[model samples]
Target: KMEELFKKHKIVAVLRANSVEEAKEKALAVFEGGVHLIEITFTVPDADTVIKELSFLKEKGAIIGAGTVTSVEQCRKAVESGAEFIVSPHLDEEISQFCKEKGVFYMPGVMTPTELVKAMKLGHTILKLFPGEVVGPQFVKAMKGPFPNVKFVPTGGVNLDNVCEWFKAGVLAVGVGSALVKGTPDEVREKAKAFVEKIRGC
Candidate 1:
């Protein structure tokens, strides 16, 4: 039950670093903050290498994945590199099909109603409402009116002040960027712990 396990391992730490070395280190720091999910975005230099190395975190209860993936090739590389899930800034049918074929969770960013419905029809129950701050919680509320069963992981611009608002909007999870990834090891861990607690109602 990857889906069940995945949601419990919520508060995905999106890692975008300069290099694989820095990315791996930064991701590990987030894990130390008491959460177990990390999304190593393709924006990082040698992202695959970082993913391959960070795969070790799985043994420690971490669910490592890839983010900003836009193509089937990137999806292939992500899967080959040991990514448990593939996340994209935009939805692609080919990537969706490939992820389905590979049995990996694919979260494609969506903003409008057309894209949302299309992504759902493509069999993705969990959608990423990118630039979440732009759309805010209200958009999610509206989506639930028609697609009450659909789930979401609102990303981009999600900060501590509004984490509760997202949960109130019924998001299954949330993806945070600079707000959760900056700072020293201890600082990152603290931020991670806070978000995890907030999401889990601790």
Candidate 2:
């Protein structure tokens, strides 16, 4: 379900909010700026509140998902909260299998080819290449050379300055956080618009 949305947007904002209202505001801002996919990190207190709030906006063409989900329990909570997909900071077969059994989209993080392959084998098509800047686009380019079938959603260290570099290297999508939502609501919206335009041009 989310795979199509991710393909359409090519960008997902990773929202880490302190309150449900804040999450709603940030999500609305990004959606208004033309982003359809949004992931609220589980690290936030009452994360399900954020997901539930945004999930109600599905009619507005928003694809609500949850990130930072490391355990099956969190995954279950995410599903109940109307998360269309689940994303994690690291590979965990248990969570992946749970999502699979529930028919939810899952994108687990992987830093090495072995982890990537293992996650893929476990039924995760969209893999998040975490700490992307640390691995660099060169790493993706090299990986694509041998494992062209694999697709990556590079996150962490991605910003206006280097997002295009990763896009040019053929990443399936990219996740941006602080760089797009760093200040007040207005500032965050403005930055999100500019960031979307910048990536759209790529």
Candidate 3:
């Protein structure tokens, strides 16, 4: 189910905004631009409130996921607030277990081979390659040599120019932030449309 969603969406807008209103606005902008999966990271103040308020978008084919979560308490709040999925900057066994118990998809941040293996062992075949600029497409390609079944959503430093490279390297999708969520609502909407079109071309 997650695989199909990723294949269809291809782009996940990692939303980090100044406030709850900005977060909600940008999320709606991107969704209107045809990017349905949105990650409202914990960095935004009262992030759960934003997620809860936007939960109605689910009826319109939106999937709201919480990002940058590092604790079970935050995860609980997010899930209770109507988040469909949960993400963290690093792999944590407890969070993994919590997501499993709650039946929510978890995409934990991973960087090194060991961490990647640890994630797989923790029942996560789909992983987030955080600070993706540092790891790049080559890293994902190389890792695929041994772990071909693993899927990656490379986040951070993923922009219009280099997004296809990640897809070329066989990523399931790309997690994009500022590149797709910055500027005025109109500008963000345009950028979101651009990204959706770009990925469709791929």
Candidate 4:
């Protein structure tokens, strides 16, 4: 169900802000732009606080989550703060186990087949291909050869121009960062809408 939903939306707005207010504002702006899923990265200072504040957006059709989470404690804080999901840049046993216990979706970053297998063995079917520029869409095409069932959601360097390429490569969704989270509220919303429009054609 989550996989199908992700495929339907096709974009995850990753929020990394300098302040709490900026983080909240960017999240709302992206939500207004039609991207219903937003990830509040731990890189943002006091990420748990931002997640807590944006928790109400669930009622408004926004699926707020925590990203860049590495430690078990950060995962704990995120779950406690009402994060609907937990995303990590790298696969961490503790964080994965913690998310499993809490029943929160975990999208751990992976690059090599070894890591992907390990993540799948740990019961994560949706994986994050971090630093997406390094591997590009070709990686997804190759990975599908064997792990066709696994869903890939690429993050980093996902701009409007190449987002369609990612979808063509068979990724379930794309996680966009600075490319979608910048400028004023209206500006950010415009960028989000542009990405959403581009994704619709894919």
Candidate 5:
């Protein structure tokens, strides 16, 4: 139940480019790899506009959303721009609670037990674990005992080397940024196929 979105489309290609054109261009390539979901970080120039433009991809079966949102105002702007979901680099109970009240999917970021408990208590179903590589899969294992029901979406430092292992450790899915969306579009598409294939079991 917690992993429905991540079930088939296991890789979330994070688009954090300098310009909207560049971000859109790379997103299409990553999408071509049969990946259905992408996260557009607010750091991109005119982030909301980028999200609005890319939302059109929804017609082609893409799930576009906003990331790095740490405030309610930012969350509102992202939603207004057609963000199907809203994610953060850190937990914000008020922001997450607002998303829940609005019926939009909210994946707030959390690393420690205190943050996890607070976010979960606020009704966030899936949480993002920033710099997943630093925390590693074992972190998820450690969190499982107290929060076995909570599913995590880990970004940063997740790559081909340890993706499946992260899933094996019980993450809802892995967010591959530069590793999955690097180089030319064709190259990124190639990476997509291989990356998606890597999650066959998870």
Candidate 6:
């Protein structure tokens, strides 16, 4: 199931909104760009409502997940609200364990080598290497040399310009926000498409 999503949408947009309407707009914009995966973060107001609304778009081939989930209750709520996967800002054994027990895709964030190793040991194959700009793509390449089987979805500081750099360095996928969704609607769509094209080249 996880493999299918990773193959289907090379880019996952992390949608953070102030209202359900804005979230819906952002999600549709992402879909308009031909991307199927969306992560509605808990930081947004009424995030569950956004998930519930988008869940109905499953027939349209949308794969929705929740982001910035740091607690077990939030994870449970996300699943109940039709989130197909769970994404967190930091590594949490409880969250990973819960997702594993429930057979849900869990992508936990990790910043350091120790955190990455610990998360991997907890049975999570995909790790979100946040602050990618700070760590840089070179770090991703270096890390992969030691943990080749591990997959990374680097978020934060990723844009169309450097997305290829990350992919070339062995990133499995990327989560883009402001770069892809912050511009005007037309610009956002163009950026998303261009980003996909950039990563496809890798």
Best by lDDT: 3
For every model shown, what is its TM-score relative to the native structure?
0.95, 0.96, 0.98, 0.97, 0.94, 0.95
lDDT of each: 0.86, 0.86, 0.92, 0.91, 0.84, 0.85
Worst ten in a row by lDDT for model 2: 1-10
Sequence-dependent TM-score of model 6: 0.95
Provide the global lDDT of candidate 5 against the true structure.
Answer: 0.84
Query: Model 1 over residues 134-167: C-alpha lDDT tens digits?
Result: 9999999998889988888889998888899998
- Local accuracy of candidate 5 as per-residue lDDT tens digits, 1-202: 2258776677788888888898898888888888888888888888888888886688998998888887788789889999887888898878877887778888888888889888878876588998788888888899888787888889988888888889888877788888988788899999989888888845
Looking at model 3, report the run of 10 residues with the lowest lDDT sum.
1-10
User: Which residue pairs collide in model 3, if any?
Assistant: none
Give the clashing residue pairs of candidate 4, or none.
Answer: none
Per-residue alpha-carbon lDDT of candidate 3 for residues 98-130, written as tens digits (9 for 90 to 100): 999988899999999999999999889989999
TM-score-based ranking: 3, 4, 2, 1, 6, 5
Candidate 2, residue 39: lDDT: 90
For 1-202, candidate 2 gives per-residue lDDT tens digits of 5777777789998988787778888888877777778898998788887888775678888888999998899899999989988999999999988987899889999999899889878867678999898998988898877788888899998999999999999988899888876577888778788878998898
Which residue ranges in model 1 land beyond 4 Å of their true spot?
Answer: none
- Give the poorly placed runs of model 4, Cα more than 4 Å off: none
> What is the per-residue lDDT of model 6 for residues 55-161, given as tens digits with 9 covering 90 to 100?
66677888999999989999998998999989998999999889888899999999888999999899877899987888988778888778888888999989878
Query: Which residues of candidate 5, in runs, are more than 4 Å off?
Result: 1-3
Best by TM-score: 3
